[PDB]
Amino acid sequence: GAPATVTEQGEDITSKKDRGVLKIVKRVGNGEETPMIGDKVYVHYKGKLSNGKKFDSSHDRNEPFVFSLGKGQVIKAWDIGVATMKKGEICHLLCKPEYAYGSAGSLPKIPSNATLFFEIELLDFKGE
Ligand SMILES: CC[C@@H]1CCCC[C@@]1(O)C(=O)C(=O)N1CCCC[C@H]1C(=O)O[C@H](CCc1ccc(OC)c(OC)c1)c1cccc(OCC(=O)O)c1
DSSP: OOHHHHHHEEEEOSOOOSEEEEEEEEEEEOOSSSOOTTTEEEEEEEETTTSEEEEEOOOTTOOOOEEESSSSSSSSSHHHHHHHHOOEEEEEEEEEETTTTTTTTTTBBBBOOOOOEEEEEEEEEEOO
């Protein structure tokens, strides 16, 4: 499924090149430039465990998810992944636990040492 496709075909977008965050662009965005640090970003997302078990989707509640990029307001994989996106883009990310919830997890939905899959749509962003 989608997570395996990211394992096989995803680009390693980590600074360390440790495959901790792997990315596939599923829909090219028409925005010209990536957001800057501190920019307010607006996204929709789906989150699943790497085995395909869904844990959340912003669409369930018709609520864009909003945060300031590159400030540690979200798990590391998201600061890394969203920094690579263009407005209008949809990507798939596969995120090793080091770049997500680590050994603690986020119980009940996310176990210890979980690799996470996300689909992320960058709806918009605005300058810091
Ligand atoms: C277990 C699933 C998780 C449960 C809390 C709500 C979000 C959640 O359902 C989820 O899908 C998730 O895993 N998210 C939400 C979408 C962005 C990616 C990811 C996330 O980063 O959630 C954080 C969780 C708190 C957090 C912040 C920073 C961290 O490291 C720098 C971190 O490391 C483990 C953990 C999040 C971020 C912002 C808002 C969140 O909830 C709403 C709120 O607090 O207003 C939740």
